[PDB]
Design a protein around this ligand. Structure first.
Ligand SMILES: Cc1cc2nc3c(=O)[nH]c(=O)nc-3n(C[C@H](O)[C@H](O)[C@H](O)COP(=O)(O)OP(=O)(O)OC[C@H]3O[C@@H](n4cnc5c(N)ncnc54)[C@H](O)[C@@H]3O)c2cc1C
Ligand SMILES: Cc1cc2nc3c(=O)[nH]c(=O)nc-3n(C[C@H](O)[C@H](O)[C@H](O)COP(=O)(O)OP(=O)(O)OC[C@H]3O[C@@H](n4cnc5c(N)ncnc54)[C@H](O)[C@@H]3O)c2cc1C
Lengths: 450, 449
């Protein structure tokens, strides 16, 4: 079929759907064209071996105000993650200690080093900000030193530097600390409101949506009706100063005034542009890449850790699994754990056989919470790296030096072509809240233009 | 058209063509499918305002034995870049000094610092090698420190550091030194035979091809006749354990036992694979990127610098133009300069208007060679970044950390899909010679079974 719209939107993830919804609200007509047999992108709720799981993005923090309004507008409610009782910390030397409150139970030197670093990171984030971190006069020096090297320049305490890295490198950017810059650590902190917010799992991992995060996309898409096309990878964008024509599988053709690429940046060159994008985009898009993380799901007869006085939360920068949390579904009698295996530790697990990998990850949940972690009734690993329409998790970031070099260009339109995804967001960078903000910002930009 | 072939080859650059050439000798049949209206890829000879220029790759060094051997087989000869008389050095203090001989005319202390850093890089390259630098016991620590931070650790002398950087960062990888690892520097050095080989423009930039480097591809492609398809971007590869179908524009459909992707790695995902490549390829390919450099060409009625006793060679790590060389065509009476503006300096020139960029570049050329450099008869800038089928220059390298993490996987086949370009080569990495070696290494693999 051939259609005529004011805006063609490539990608029916939360970012494209939020842009579509805002455009519709303002009276513009839209078509959203999606590759997969479903909407939601990196958010997805599925049933595996009888257990309902969130395969992707799921948590809402209190600074995610754009996602919180959108939830309210769609009739969706939240619930809080279980946090009663003791958390577990595993030290660099391998000592396992139960604790409550909000510092790790390390020796005092380490604790004071961590506090000081948290404070320095909060300070940098408040000064530099998430809107245009590259523009600050401190930015050049921060963007040309790796986060690993910057931590070495700040502190002699190995354990403190490893735990600070746990929160940014394994915990957010899903890349090793030697491979992105101090500035990129600052941006990640600023985007979430402060580094202290990313440190406190009670803040950044506070709530979930009743019915799952994918419902945010599913409900936006339901309201768009026949203007959403599924099973339709977009292959070609033909453009000029006044116009873009978008071509997709199934003989789909959309003639639009503007196009929104609502896809992560590592995937822009999956589409052919006629004429080609300018040199600056050709170069910039090469320097953007997704991290890699395994999101592990483990379902048990009950949340057994709660009988032992444990919250289910566990941190260990030297473990294969660096984080574990209670991920029990709203009103479920069965318990579910969630755990994360990050970057180079993920590659290492994927090189083991499926059997050996499972055994290694369950051994590690057992190190945190006890030998009952070893007996789930359902076990599943989210595998976003294999998915050709994602190719990693959670989200994309520049290589080292790319944030200062290309950051000012990452949202600029090219003629009628706009860009919108969480991976180029300011507040809410990498999160559904960022996807939502960017979709709304791109919509408002198009509306003013037209 | 639909055709059957033993091997379908995507890309008619030197790597694809060298592979097709080797495959035919064994009696395997081939189709070589090429996006552009020409062969050669990053090699290309063109005529701008009536003056002939090598828009891309052009120089041959004595360690480039796969290339040299191929030139002989194709009946092509070489000539040497003019090098008589004095070179020019521009110091960090902006001081300009004519010199000859094998080191920069700096003070003795800076000279000792440079020498020590060159010996250190030679030693690392000799221990580590180009074949699998990631497997060496020193590899992890070299690959997690940037080259800039490694230089800072080795030497406190900023002029000596910037000068070593000139040869590797602006001069090869065309990325700034804070963005790639020490191990990647060591690779670049091992791949050319040593770091000293890259410091000596009389080695790395020794010879050119009579008739132009593009002739290497042109001749190879001529011998293949109707098995080369031009103006045919490949869009899809459908594959299983025993075979592939390759689909290109113009309704080309090639059914084959093996496919070679003879394209730089930042372009692999311009193609759809059915079923998708595995996760490890999905990830690795995102971590590969081309550098950026403006190859500047300036043509004058004579090689005027030779009249002032200058070789045409100039170096200055702080200039916008960090290098200038005599690039006079074989038996032309007109003189031609070649010059390079690398990485973030290229981004900054591209941000000015064309007129202001040209004046800024020619001002810098004038500082090396005199006010005559500012009145060329023909001026041209190679723009590979704008080409959708290249998108940068000279070649691709990992981001920081990628070489150790992914290196061992960069040549591995996926089922019947093989990978062959200069950007994944061992010896000859990033150069025509590496493209030839990889093309021949891939063909030998497929041939042997
Ligand atoms: C395991 C995991 C855990 C995460 N944790 C959370 C968390 O707890 N909280 C949170 O808020 N965020 C989290 N995130 C991140 C969050 O899911 C993403 O930031 C957000 O989904 C990004 O949305 P987007 O619309 O910007 O891109 P995406 O959701 O990736 O959507 C892009 C869409 O475009 C489609 N597409 C791509 N190319 C084409 C093409 N050529 N043609 C047609 N369609 C195309 C894709 O199929 C996809 O549907 C997590 C993600 C993962 C994977
Ligand atoms: C400014 C510049 C200066 C250089 N300096 C030197 C030097 O002097 N000496 C030296 O040895 N090397 C030099 N190089 C590097 C050298 O030219 C490259 O190493 C070499 O050409 C690599 O050859 P290749 O076959 O691996 O890839 P390429 O030459 O890039 O060829 C790949 C081919 O694939 C085609 N292609 C890509 N995608 C598709 C697709 N989907 N479908 C069909 N076709 C496709 C492209 O059009 C291209 O023709 C220079 C390069 C440049 C750009």
């Amino acid at each position: 079929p051939t259609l005529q719209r004011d805006v063609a939107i490539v990608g029916a993830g939360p970012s494209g759907l939020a842009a579509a919804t805002a455009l519709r609200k303002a009276g513009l007509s839209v078509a959203v064209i999606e590759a997969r047999d479903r909407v939601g992108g990196r958010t997805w709720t599925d049933t595996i071996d009888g257990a309902v799981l969130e395969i992707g993005g799921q948590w809402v923090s209190p600074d995610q105000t754009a996602l919180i309004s959108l939830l309210d507008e769609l009739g969706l409610k939240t619930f809080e993650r279980y946090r009663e009782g003791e958390s577990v910390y595993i030290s660099s030397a391998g000592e396992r200690t139960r604790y409550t409150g909000d510092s790790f139970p390390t020796n005092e030197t380490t604790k004071k080093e961590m506090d000081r670093l948290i404070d320095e990171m909060d300070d940098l984030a408040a000064q530099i900000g998430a809107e245009e971190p590259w523009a600050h006069p401190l930015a050049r020096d921060l963007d040309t030193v790796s986060f690993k090297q910057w931590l070495i320049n700040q502190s002699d305490d190995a354990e403190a530097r490893d735990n600070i890295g746990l929160f940014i490198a394994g915990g957010m950017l899903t890349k090793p600390a030697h491979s992105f810059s101090a500035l990129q650590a600052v941006l990640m902190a600023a985007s979430a409101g402060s580094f202290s917010h990313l440190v406190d799992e009670d803040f950044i991992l506070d709530k979930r949506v009743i019915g799952g995060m994918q419902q945010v996309s599913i409900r936006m898409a339901e309201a768009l009706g026949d203007d959403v096309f599924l099973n339709a990878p977009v292959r070609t964008v033909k453009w000029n100063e006044s116009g873009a024509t978008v071509l997709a599988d199934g003989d789909i053709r959309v003639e639009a005034s503007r196009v929104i690429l609502a896809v992560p940046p590592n995937l822009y060159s999956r589409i052919s542009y006629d004429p080609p994008l300018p040199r600056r985009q050709h170069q910039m898009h090469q320097h953007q890449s997704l991290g890699l993380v395994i999101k592990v799901h483990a379902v048990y007869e009950t949340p057994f850790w709660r009988e032992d006085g444990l919250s289910g939360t566990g941190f260990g920068a030297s473990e294969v699994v660096q984080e574990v949390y209670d991920n029990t579904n709203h009103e479920d009698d069965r318990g579910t754990l969630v755990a994360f295996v990050s970057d180079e530790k993920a590659d290492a697990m994927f090189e083991l056989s499926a059997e050996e990998r499972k055994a290694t990850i369950l051994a590690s949940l057992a190190r945190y919470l006890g030998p009952k972690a070893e007996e789930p009734v359902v076990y599943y690993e989210s595998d976003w790296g294999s998915e050709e329409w994602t190719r990693g998790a959670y989200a994309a970031s520049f290589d080292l030096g790319g944030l200062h070099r290309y950051g000012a260009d990452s949202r600029t339109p090219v003629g009628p072509i706009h860009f919108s995804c969480s991976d180029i967001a300011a507040e809410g960078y990498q999160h559904v809240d960022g996807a939502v903000r960017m979709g709304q910002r791109t919509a408002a930009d198009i509306i003013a233009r037209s």
